[model samples]
Target: AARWDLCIDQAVVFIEDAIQYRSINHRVDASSMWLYRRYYSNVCQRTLSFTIFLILFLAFIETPSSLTSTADVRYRAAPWEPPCGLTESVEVLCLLVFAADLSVKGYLFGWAHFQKNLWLLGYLVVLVVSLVDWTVSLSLVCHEPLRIRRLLRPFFLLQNSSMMKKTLKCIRWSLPEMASVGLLLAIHLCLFTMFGMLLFAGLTYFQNLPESLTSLLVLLTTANNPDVMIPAYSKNRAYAIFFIVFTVIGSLFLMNLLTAIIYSQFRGYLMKSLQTSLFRRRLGTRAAFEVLSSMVGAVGVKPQNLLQVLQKVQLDSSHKQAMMEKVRSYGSVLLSAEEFQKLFNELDRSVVKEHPPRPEYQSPFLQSAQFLFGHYYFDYLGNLIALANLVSICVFLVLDADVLPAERDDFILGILNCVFIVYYLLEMLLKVFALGLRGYLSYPSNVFDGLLTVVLLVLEISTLAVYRLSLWDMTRMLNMLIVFRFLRIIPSMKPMAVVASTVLGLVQNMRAFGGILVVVYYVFAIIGINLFRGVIVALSAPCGSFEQLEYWANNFDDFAAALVTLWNLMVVNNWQVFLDAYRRYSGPWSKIYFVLWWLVSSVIWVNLFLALILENFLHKW
Candidate 1:
């Protein structure tokens, strides 16, 4: 029985090691599992999966609109349809490759384990349907085309992408909670829709039930907002109240509530998923400890035994040393599995450095200066001086706004600027003497203070020395940097500092997402330029006056203009006007492009940004 238990412990250790390496295959013995892992981990196999995904995406987008006539009982393709033979053959080849890949995976993982992956099962269904689709299309007996596979092609792409799968899972998880909020919004819309239909009976927007509902729905997005109310408001000023009430309740209140719900649900699920993964790792670690303890006679693990286990773990030598040191700090006590797991857990924790101690100066004068500079009252005095400088700058700027360029150099304000600059320079010099240069620069706020003061002092000196130089112009520009000095006060106020830090952290985190947003905007802008370039022109008096054409600056006439128009669309700032203008000039299908941009940029990416901010805020709190 002892030998059997030892065997079991060895098996657990082997399995856990395999799992850690992500190469476990229960269906195969060790030699066969090597091949299993090799096949799955092959670059060629991964490339094929990605290639299949690309093919399916291409097939999905490239499939043409079909035309069918009842009288002739024949299907016809759109004039713009590309020759289908090459695309169809390529798609068939990809599907065949995927089929072989899927069969291999099924065999390697065991058919039961493979079938448990719903994505694979769904891929199988799509594969079968695609094969059938190819066969039917090749036969050419039926005149009508079967495009069912085209509809299902996106499934292949979705199934292949883990990120998309996680997103879909998040959506599925959030749907139940989102449904109640959505229903509340719908009820709000319905009430307003009916009210608008009754209230503005004669207006074009609220002429009938469907029109009123559609109008109110549009109003909820604040798209064609004022236009929806203007006609009725022009007739009776009292009608303005109805639209205002609806907008306040629907757009402002309900829409915000929906966004808040989505954000909270997303954050909740994210944290839960994080906790779940952490729990899994802890369990795995505990099991590893159990196996190691059993191997070492199963009483408790000594620091030395735990070090042996840590050696087996895939970690850096430095990390291993740190773990050993931590274990040794527990003073030679034998640790249980739980204690071992807890020790491992400490490795994941963040370490914050304590503030460096103040340097001792041998010179009595320098030490006295350091003590005086470090005093709390000295810091308050600096803040008060900064506030006074800001107020004086603001007052001078207001006075300078209407003053002629030649008359702009005010005698009093120039003296004030000189005084403030000299005072700030002196303050920085005293701090450097007190803290030493390295110590002064150690704090980021101090670095900013020193850098700005030095720059401004240099700029001021240069402006005085060079009479003909535009150095004064540059000096004026740098003057704006002084406003950022207010940021120094933020850390002193705890609650505001938390928010400020959260925002700063959020900006750092948003770099990647911001790039993604820019790419989305760029792609959409390019598409807009291609589709609607030169579509807007000077309009006549009846449709629109030439002067009124100036307002139509949101046109896709150039790349920059296209980006501007897209930004307008994203903000939903009178977007329907642009939509209508584009539809009238370009075509009705122009709306589809706008709609796609709105869905991708405004809906998905913007909400994702908001969710990120909310997550950061909550985390900081």
Candidate 2:
């Protein structure tokens, strides 16, 4: 009773907090007045602000029916579609929103507030400018084109310094690592797409074979969805082959190269702040400064500023010919995995760093999130979303089917939207309401993804909640459950997905890895077959039962033949082979290797594979 009363009281306080009417002159902070400007938008002040920004951002991402649905009233006048209505009205309002923020900053901070608060204001400018550029080229009222520069929002947001480089050490190590990971992802996606096409198209040739088959050899691949699985072709085999090959090269190599290039640029952009900050902090001591200065460059720091200076230091130089060698110095600390572990161990002994060993691995909250996802990680509002998703999925799956048939889907999906979508709206609301639309668009992909998910969710709920059940409807929507199953993929968003996918992958491949069952049986079956076959032949005495060798080989040879046949059929291909073969050859003599290995490898070791994988890959950040 007390707990329920307290919950109701907190809920009332929270509701009151959300609706309270005061903007707090958010423009001052958006304008970059002072550091206080940043702190001004605290978690509490902004919860309400988020609600406002969320609605606007969602409107901006979604296809709007008319200008009235959005603030881009100017775009309302343009003929809807790409280029025609892209920037006529809606985007202009977004730009003005930022200019207002800038004007507010000018009033509070300075006309040059951008330079003073470059980390904050520079990003705001980028975000605001990007928004203006987006509205100018494409309306927030409709779908943004993939063909234009307007689509590069995710990179813009992640590369923003204020959220990304909140810490020096993280900026140095993590930014480079993540850039490398981006390169890795690009390579993987391209290769996977190509390989996926190859694998699927190959299967098409086999679709009728009902047995082993091939495709590329058969010259069957999709020309349009080069990503599509290929099948046996018409007379245009040559065309299919060329198209598939072209797509393979384009997606694999060219795309990865592009990703590598962008990753290089962004990596440098992220590293510059830390390099400059460290250089300034380690100022003075001419030789040491020179050594350190070699790693620093004219980035972020104003070139003419005194703080940028490093004293000239003497260096070993033979002549202008040797200048390249003498003018620069470099050193790297290399530690092999073992050495690194030992060094960490030594550090561990001297000082108990990372105490209590972090009860779980990474916090799985803000810390590792900050490193991988940037600002998205900083927002704990999404955690509530994850909880809502959990509740919705579990409750939907577990709830009684007869309850609220009319509102069944609505009851589930409504709460889902209210929870996850609402929180996403909250994030957007914070950006738009506090920082303006530019601030909101700066995190473009996030806004885009959220927009897409919400649109899909709403349509889905309509299809589900308002669904009229019929045999025809059931037939049409039989695949609907698969869509829900697809939601299983989102758990990958959580850091723990690394642990889960690995376990699942291992469990999935257990039949292959534990094929040791086949191998052992194979050796035993072969030995029995060779030994028994010859004996049975030698026992070709006239009588069917009288000859000692003939009778022994006949009875036992049939038994051995069964074992060999069972091993090939059961332990090799279909997993059903294991159980079938067990009934045939699972005698006392064969039981040790069969039962023992099956129990240890298939059952215990399969789980070990998952456990070992999780232990190895689970990271601190």
Candidate 3:
């Protein structure tokens, strides 16, 4: 009862504080100002603003019957008019509420100071503009459809809501990195477009220069039927190599560059702020400034305006002297968190240079085991061992999958699998004896090999049992584990190691790259369904040009099929033959879709993998 009474008292005091202001001007430090702002940023206001924005967005997208319709009058705007008209009234109410809130903020914060915020300034400009238009067209009105100027009223909700502000901040954090990546894509586009024009311009086989460039673009992006390539290659053998070279460079190399830029930036952000700020309701400018203020030696001081924060805070004469001494020069106001971390990390590294202690062997055989398994530890020897393992693994997989059409060498392959398993088990035992359990698990490769050995043990035993017993049901399902043994080789080779690290890096930054790929696939997949659905049905005769039509029909049969087909092409998996049939059905202008697909999918999205791996390569990790 006492706790409840105290809570009620606190609520009453909060209300009183908000109702009464000590200063006529808005003071961020004022308790009343803070309380009011908090009150204004509550869920009710956020939901109210969100609801208003949603309604306005719906109204704008509906689009009134006449382009020239004014907000207050609808002449003959049929079915959509009632809902649209209701939204317009609701929009005015929302903006009115927004303007009144702004008015209170202006009076509290000081109007001139409040005008400094771009979001606030934008709201006023749009609101005033809409009202002016409304006043100008107030004469005896039947509503048509208002232009977007009136629809612009909705965004005031977006700027004012705390939820929206946080969302905007998140986007702002990523904008610089995204812009640079986009610039890289733009550069790739310019170079490839010029290259396509130069290479295919004068070919006699093409219908015209436009057709040649279009064809070049189609080949670069669209899945080409390998069959079509025979016709082109027969004309100019150089064309085959030229097209392949350009396709590789444009599709793989450049796209990777874009991917690298995004991944690096993503990792950079994640390494610092994102690690802390990704979750939690850390909203808006003040939250960021608070993070800045909390850095060592700068507590209780905002960092955005460093000179002001510096002047405002009280400093001890000794502390000031120490800070001045630490600065190599005297002009700077505040040190950034990144700079401080770099200096601190540098000092930390000097204390620990990371020279791993050597493993102590109990005897000569243990020493020999360590010498080979843990050897000169260069990639050359590791590469050979890993390569041998991969060859054996590949042979095992072919037999396992039944992909090849030869007789089954069950005994020979079974013996090879056993030999491979024993060799791995032997290697693991040697390392454990030499390095002990602690040292043996230190290398990621040892851990992976240990896991692979256990898997192979189970797989080999199961196979032997099923083979002898000939339990067809169990035998058929038992050996899929054999295929996964290939993972053991990844950590052993330098090239494969680079690929593994890059793939890991891409997964880290997949939020950005994966989102781009997903959007492209969805948009293009929808387009594929729309463009080819009718054409696919129309091409059922299955002769002449239609030979490829059946392939395209299967590929673009529906939205789901299109995604599968596009994914296959995006990965460069026999896309050449897969895409040729598409061109035949769609004819000339169809090249545009394929070319666009290449720019977004192959050049930009697929290239991210290349970018990520190259970073791992250069870092020598």
lDDT of 1 by residue, 377-459 (tens): 88778899989988877887777777685655555655666788899998987777666777786788788788888887887
Candidate 2 CA-lDDT value: 0.37
Evaluated with TM-score, which candidate comes out highest? 1
**In model 3, which regions exceed 4 Å deviation?**
1-409, 412-442, 469-511, 530-554, 558-560, 568-592, 603-621
Best candidate (score: lDDT)? 1
Please list the C-alpha lDDT of all candidates, in the order they appear: 0.64, 0.37, 0.51
Q: Please state the error at residue 619 of candidate 1 in Å.
A: 6.4
Per residue, candidate 2 scores C-alpha lDDT tens digits across 407-438 of: 34434444444445545555555444444455
lDDT value, candidate 1, whole model: 0.64
Per-residue error for 522 in candidate 3, Å, reads 2.9
